[PDB]
Design a protein around this motif. Structure first.
Motif, mmCIF file in Angstrom:
data_model
loop_
_atom_site.group_PDB
_atom_site.id
_atom_site.type_symbol
_atom_site.label_atom_id
_atom_site.label_comp_id
_atom_site.label_asym_id
_atom_site.label_seq_id
_atom_site.Cartn_x
_atom_site.Cartn_y
_atom_site.Cartn_z
ATOM 1 N N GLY A 172 0.779 -1.218 0.000
ATOM 2 C CA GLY A 172 0.000 0.000 0.000
ATOM 3 C C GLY A 172 0.813 1.271 0.000
ATOM 4 O O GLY A 172 0.228 2.361 -0.018
ATOM 5 N N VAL A 173 2.137 1.169 0.010
ATOM 6 C CA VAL A 173 3.031 2.317 -0.015
ATOM 7 C C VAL A 173 3.846 2.248 -1.296
ATOM 8 O O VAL A 173 4.293 1.170 -1.699
ATOM 9 C CB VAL A 173 3.944 2.345 1.228
ATOM 10 C CG1 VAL A 173 5.021 3.408 1.091
ATOM 11 C CG2 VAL A 173 3.119 2.569 2.479
ATOM 12 N N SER A 174 4.021 3.395 -1.945
ATOM 13 C CA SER A 174 4.645 3.418 -3.259
ATOM 14 C C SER A 174 5.529 4.641 -3.438
ATOM 15 O O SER A 174 5.476 5.581 -2.639
ATOM 16 C CB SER A 174 3.580 3.393 -4.352
ATOM 17 O OG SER A 174 2.818 4.583 -4.318
ATOM 18 N N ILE A 175 6.350 4.626 -4.482
ATOM 19 C CA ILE A 175 7.224 5.745 -4.798
ATOM 20 C C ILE A 175 7.020 6.095 -6.267
ATOM 21 O O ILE A 175 7.464 7.147 -6.742
ATOM 22 C CB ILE A 175 8.688 5.396 -4.476
ATOM 23 C CG1 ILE A 175 9.580 6.632 -4.556
ATOM 24 C CG2 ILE A 175 9.184 4.291 -5.390
ATOM 25 C CD1 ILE A 175 10.942 6.432 -3.949
ATOM 26 N N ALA A 176 6.324 5.216 -6.992
ATOM 27 C CA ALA A 176 6.186 5.356 -8.437
ATOM 28 C C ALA A 176 5.033 6.275 -8.829
ATOM 29 O O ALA A 176 5.180 7.102 -9.735
ATOM 30 C CB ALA A 176 6.004 3.977 -9.070
ATOM 31 N N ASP A 177 3.879 6.148 -8.172
ATOM 32 C CA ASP A 177 2.704 6.919 -8.565
ATOM 33 C C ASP A 177 2.690 8.333 -8.000
ATOM 34 O O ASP A 177 1.794 9.110 -8.348
ATOM 35 C CB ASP A 177 1.425 6.186 -8.149
ATOM 36 C CG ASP A 177 1.489 5.658 -6.732
ATOM 37 O OD1 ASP A 177 1.236 4.451 -6.541
ATOM 38 O OD2 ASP A 177 1.800 6.440 -5.810
ATOM 39 N N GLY A 178 3.641 8.685 -7.141
ATOM 40 C CA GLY A 178 3.688 10.033 -6.615
ATOM 41 C C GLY A 178 2.631 10.356 -5.588
ATOM 42 O O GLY A 178 2.268 11.526 -5.437
ATOM 43 N N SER A 179 2.113 9.351 -4.877
ATOM 44 C CA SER A 179 1.122 9.618 -3.841
ATOM 45 C C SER A 179 1.707 10.444 -2.702
ATOM 46 O O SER A 179 0.979 11.185 -2.034
ATOM 47 C CB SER A 179 0.549 8.304 -3.309
ATOM 48 O OG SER A 179 1.537 7.550 -2.633
ATOM 49 N N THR A 180 3.014 10.337 -2.470
ATOM 50 C CA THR A 180 3.688 11.116 -1.444
ATOM 51 C C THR A 180 4.969 11.692 -2.026
ATOM 52 O O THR A 180 5.543 11.141 -2.970
ATOM 53 C CB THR A 180 3.996 10.277 -0.194
ATOM 54 O OG1 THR A 180 4.434 11.137 0.865
ATOM 55 C CG2 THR A 180 5.072 9.242 -0.486
ATOM 56 N N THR A 181 5.404 12.823 -1.466
ATOM 57 C CA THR A 181 6.560 13.520 -2.018
ATOM 58 C C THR A 181 7.849 12.731 -1.830
ATOM 59 O O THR A 181 8.692 12.708 -2.734
ATOM 60 C CB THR A 181 6.699 14.903 -1.382
ATOM 61 O OG1 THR A 181 7.347 14.782 -0.111
ATOM 62 C CG2 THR A 181 5.335 15.540 -1.195
ATOM 63 N N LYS A 182 8.020 12.076 -0.686
ATOM 64 C CA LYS A 182 9.264 11.369 -0.410
ATOM 65 C C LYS A 182 9.035 10.374 0.716
ATOM 66 O O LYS A 182 8.058 10.466 1.464
ATOM 67 C CB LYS A 182 10.391 12.338 -0.043
ATOM 68 C CG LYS A 182 10.166 13.084 1.258
ATOM 69 C CD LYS A 182 11.298 14.056 1.534
ATOM 70 C CE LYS A 182 11.086 14.793 2.844
ATOM 71 N NZ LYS A 182 12.187 15.756 3.121
ATOM 72 N N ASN A 209 13.454 11.056 -2.549
ATOM 73 C CA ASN A 209 12.377 11.782 -3.204
ATOM 74 C C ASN A 209 11.663 10.889 -4.208
ATOM 75 O O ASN A 209 12.294 10.140 -4.958
ATOM 76 C CB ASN A 209 12.921 13.023 -3.907
ATOM 77 C CG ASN A 209 13.894 13.799 -3.047
ATOM 78 O OD1 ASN A 209 15.107 13.624 -3.151
ATOM 79 N ND2 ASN A 209 13.366 14.660 -2.187
ATOM 80 N N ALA A 210 10.337 10.963 -4.214
ATOM 81 C CA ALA A 210 9.555 10.173 -5.152
ATOM 82 C C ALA A 210 9.657 10.750 -6.559
ATOM 83 O O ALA A 210 9.796 11.960 -6.750
ATOM 84 C CB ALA A 210 8.093 10.113 -4.714
ATOM 85 N N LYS A 211 9.587 9.865 -7.549
ATOM 86 C CA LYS A 211 9.600 10.249 -8.961
ATOM 87 C C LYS A 211 8.347 9.675 -9.613
ATOM 88 O O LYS A 211 8.264 8.467 -9.857
ATOM 89 C CB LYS A 211 10.862 9.765 -9.672
ATOM 90 C CG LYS A 211 12.105 10.622 -9.457
ATOM 91 C CD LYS A 211 12.698 10.474 -8.071
ATOM 92 C CE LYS A 211 13.981 11.274 -7.945
ATOM 93 N NZ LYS A 211 14.526 11.243 -6.562
ATOM 94 N N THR A 212 7.374 10.540 -9.888
ATOM 95 C CA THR A 212 6.130 10.096 -10.500
ATOM 96 C C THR A 212 6.384 9.584 -11.911
ATOM 97 O O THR A 212 7.010 10.259 -12.732
ATOM 98 C CB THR A 212 5.120 11.244 -10.535
ATOM 99 O OG1 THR A 212 4.852 11.689 -9.200
ATOM 100 C CG2 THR A 212 3.823 10.792 -11.185
ATOM 101 N N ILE A 213 5.878 8.386 -12.198
ATOM 102 C CA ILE A 213 6.059 7.748 -13.494
ATOM 103 C C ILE A 213 4.731 7.396 -14.150
ATOM 104 O O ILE A 213 4.709 6.671 -15.144
ATOM 105 C CB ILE A 213 6.970 6.509 -13.381
ATOM 106 C CG1 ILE A 213 6.346 5.456 -12.466
ATOM 107 C CG2 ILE A 213 8.352 6.901 -12.882
ATOM 108 C CD1 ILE A 213 7.071 4.133 -12.491
ATOM 109 N N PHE A 265 17.021 8.753 5.632
ATOM 110 C CA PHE A 265 17.625 8.468 4.328
ATOM 111 C C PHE A 265 16.628 8.971 3.287
ATOM 112 O O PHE A 265 15.828 8.198 2.757
ATOM 113 C CB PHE A 265 17.923 6.979 4.158
ATOM 114 C CG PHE A 265 18.985 6.683 3.136
ATOM 115 C CD1 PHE A 265 20.238 6.241 3.519
ATOM 116 C CD2 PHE A 265 18.730 6.866 1.788
ATOM 117 C CE1 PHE A 265 21.209 5.973 2.578
ATOM 118 C CE2 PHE A 265 19.696 6.602 0.844
ATOM 119 C CZ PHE A 265 20.936 6.155 1.240
ATOM 120 N N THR A 266 16.677 10.270 3.004
ATOM 121 C CA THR A 266 15.671 10.885 2.150
ATOM 122 C C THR A 266 15.713 10.287 0.748
ATOM 123 O O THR A 266 16.777 10.159 0.139
ATOM 124 C CB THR A 266 15.888 12.397 2.084
ATOM 125 O OG1 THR A 266 15.789 12.953 3.401
ATOM 126 C CG2 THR A 266 14.838 13.045 1.198
#
Lengths: 54, 54
Positions: free
Chosen positions: B25-35, B50-54, B47-48
Motif C-alpha cells: 500500500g506504499v509506493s514511490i512510483a505513482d507520486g502519492s507522497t513527495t518522499k 524523493n519520489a519520482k512520479t512515473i 535516508f531521504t
C-alpha cells in the motif's frame, strides 16, 4: 545529468558514512576533535593519537 | 482508426500499470507522497528518497 545524479548520491553516501563513524560519543575520524589521548602508564602519561578527519 | 485504437488501449494499460505499482500500500512510483524517509542510525537520522512520479 545521470552521471551528475550518481556522483551526488555517492557524495551523500560519503558524508553519511563519515558522520556515522562514532564510538561511545567519541570519534577520531569525523573531525569533532583535534586528537584523542588514552592512558599509557599508571602515572597518567597518555598515548597520543592524532585525529585523521575523513 | 486501428492504430488509434491500439494507441488508446496501450494508454489505458500504461495508466493502470502505473497505478498497480505499490508495496504493502506504499509506493514511490505513482507520486502519492513527495518522499519516503528511511532509517540510517540509532538516532533516527533519515535516508531521504524523493519520489519520482512515473
Amino acid at each position: 545529468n545521470a552521471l551528475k545524479s550518481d556522483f551526488d548520491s555517492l557524495r551523500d553516501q560519503i558524508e553519511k558514512a563519515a558522520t556515522n563513524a562514532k564510538f561511545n560519543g567519541v570519534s577520531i575520524a569525523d573531525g569533532s576533535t583535534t586528537k584523542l589521548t588514552f592512558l599509557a602508564n599508571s602515572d597518567g602519561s597518555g598515548f597520543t593519537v592524532n585525529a585523521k578527519t575523513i
